[PDB]
Every structure is written in C-alpha cells, then in structure tokens.
Amino acid sequence: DEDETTALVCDNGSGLVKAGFAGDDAPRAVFPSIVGRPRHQGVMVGMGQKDSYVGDEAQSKRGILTLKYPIEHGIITNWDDMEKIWHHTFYNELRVAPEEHPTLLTEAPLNPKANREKMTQIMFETFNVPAMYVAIQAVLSLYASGRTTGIVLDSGDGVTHNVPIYEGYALPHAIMRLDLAGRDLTDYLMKILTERGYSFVTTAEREIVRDIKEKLCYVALDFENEMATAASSSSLEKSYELPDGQVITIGNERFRCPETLFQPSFIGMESAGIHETTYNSIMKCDIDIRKDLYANNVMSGGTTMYPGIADRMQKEITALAPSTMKIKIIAPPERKYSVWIGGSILASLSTFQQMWITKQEYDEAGPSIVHRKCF
Amino acid sequence: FDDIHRKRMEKDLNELQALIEAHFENRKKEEEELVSLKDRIERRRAERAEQQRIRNEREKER
C-alpha cells in the first residue's frame, strides 16, 4: 500500500516484533513473537481451526494453545515459525510485501553468526526480498538516542549487550554480553508469586505474569529501603486483576523481581549486575574515551522503562566511578521501541544505500554473504 | 543546538494552548453531551419505569 520502495524495518526479538517502514519515527505495529498451537483434541465438526496461530491470533485463541517464541535470547532457531511471523507482520499489518521492498533486520554485536545468516536466507528465499541488511542493535540504539559516543544498555527481553561505541567506532574488547534479561524476570516473578500462594507454571500463567510485570513492576532507587517498607506494610502493595477474575496482591515482589537486574544472584546468575557491566565496559576503554562514555550511558530496550532504573544505575555507576568526572544516563521516552527507530534512521541514510546485499550477490554467494557484506 | 530548545518550547507551548483547550473542551463537549444525553436517558428510563409499574398494577387488577 506504500507508494515508494522504502525499506521495511523490523526488530524480531524474543519478546516483541516491532515493524514499520523506513522513514517513519515509530513502528506502525507491535505484537509478540508468538506462534501458537492447539494442545487439545477437536470434537466439533466444521469449526475451521488452524494448525498454528500467529501473533495476536496466538494470544487471542491461547486458551487451548501452547505458545512458543521462535527467538531464543536474541537468536532465531525456529525459522519456520518466524516465516509465519514475518508474513503476518508484513502482509496483515503493514500491508507490504518484501518482494517489492529491501528489508532491514537487527541483532546484538556478539549475537552468534547463525542468526544473521538464517534471517538473510529466509528473507531472500521465501519472501524474495530484492535486498537485505542485518543491522547492529547497538548502532540503531545510539542512532535513535542521538549519540555517536556512549554505552548501549539494551536490557530487553533476550539479552543485555553492554557495548561501548566511540565516534561511531566499536570498542569490542569492552563488550560485556550478559545472560540477564526481561525474559528471566518473567520466570522469576512466577516463582516469587508462587511463594505468595499464587503458583504460575503454564503458558497462560506466564503471559499473565508478563502482564503483571509490565504493569506493576519497578526497581526503585534504594532497594533495601523499598524492601524494608514493602515487606512491612500494605501501603506498598498493588493489586492485579487476572483474566479469570482472580485478584493477586503483590508486595515486595513488585521490585524484588526487577532488582535481579542489579542483583542477578536472585536467579542464580554469576553477575555483579547491569550497573557493573556498564562501569567495566567503560573502565576497559582508554581514558580519553571514558570521559565521554561515562557521561553518555544510553538506555534502549525494555526494563529501562522501570521507575528508578536510570537513577539506580546512574547512582551505582557514579559510586564506582571516579570524582570530578560526570556520570549520566540518557533514558529517552522512545524507550523499548528505540531500536526500531534506529533501524528507520539507518535504512533511510543516503550513506547506507551501498550497504545492501542485493538478490544477485545473495544467490551467487549464499546466505553466508551477510557475514561479509553487513559489518 | 539552542534552536532545538526553542523548537521544543514552540511545540510545547503550541501544544499547551492546544491542550488547555483540548483537555477542557474535549471534556466539556463529551461530558456535557454525555450528561445531557444521559440526563435524558435517565429521565426516559424513569418515565418508562413508572409506566411499567402502572402497567403492572393494571394487570394485577385484570
């Protein structure tokens, strides 16, 4: 329905699928990266019924479906379910067809190469896209925030990346890829809500908990003080209404979950927290770099939207950092969806139109070509 | 750079006035239309309710 061959831009993560066209300032539509399948035997005849449901269809009919996410902490493994997600994203939402548009997809700098190769292969072989470009999420995160220099803190559902970039250059030795993410917070919250007498173990229950987290959770600037009062009084409790009419009242779990970002040991992770990884990624850089990176810690992705998160990390980084120098976190409202915006910025740059893999070079070389053409 | 800040104030103040007006007017239009409408719905329902109460009394006599 577009009147120009604008690139399509999409962030296909372990959580949400964000999509729109290059040149806009927001995805046109956002939905979960879900393909659902019936877990029951049908008994009525002439009921239609799909073998599998996609995106909002998967959630709408979820009462009898098991729901799977094709992307595992940033990498695509179930490419067949992702073909369905892309087809839905492009044709039933954006009303575009990749065949008529070049397409940009994105991944973290230390994301296994298999992800970039499979995304390239499917868009060229099943969607017949005229061109492809796998972008770096860190590049897109700083484009959207307006920086050439800073730390990308992309703390979303899949993985936290923690990468320093200076004057548009990577400083890769200082990347602290961390297995701590929004996806772990959903499962951790299911376990601490179990402690309160409300057990959650199934897909429907997981989707309920993901909704509780997204609507009730925060981290707070001072954890121990927030904990002491939440654990002592109903004044810091907040209720949540479940799809079936049940009501759950949540106290310190409201922040104890999110606090795992600063205290990863809560989920058994060997980590000092996201503020230390930010700190060390800067400390491993030269001193004429550090002055600019400490003043530009930049948030992207989910969990960055929690109350107290920018202040919590800035406080800890500042405490670890030397004096005189200023430490600051950049945390714009275009949060959680800013990498998509960065994709639009990259896709539309004149300096980027020579970076595309065309569907000529692709067939001559095969999908491994992405490893040499994109970055 | 400082022009960014000026542009921000220009859009925020153009928005402020658009908003003082939209905030108030969207409510006055929706809200006064809603009560006027539902003041009438409330009265019509009350009239019908009285009429049905009368109808029930008449049937009881029948």
């Binding site: 005189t324 200023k326 600051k328 714009p332 409202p333 | 800040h5 921000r8 925020d12 908003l19």
Partner: peptide, 29 residues
C-alpha cells in the same frame, strides 16, 4: 500525567544541563 512525563524530562534535562554548566563554569577555573 502526560504533561508531566514530558515536562519532567524537559526540566530534569534542562536543570541537569544547566547545573552541569554551572559546575563547569566554576570548575574550569
């Protein structure tokens, strides 16, 4: 409070920047 969410960002950023300027203006010596 949408008005606040943005005014909040505007003022925190503007005061932080103004403060950073106040501190540097003196600190530069």
């Amino acid at each position: 409070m949408d008005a606040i969410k943005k005014k909040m960002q505007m003022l925190k950023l503007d005061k932080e920047n103004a403060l950073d300027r106040a501190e540097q203006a003196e600190a530069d010596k």
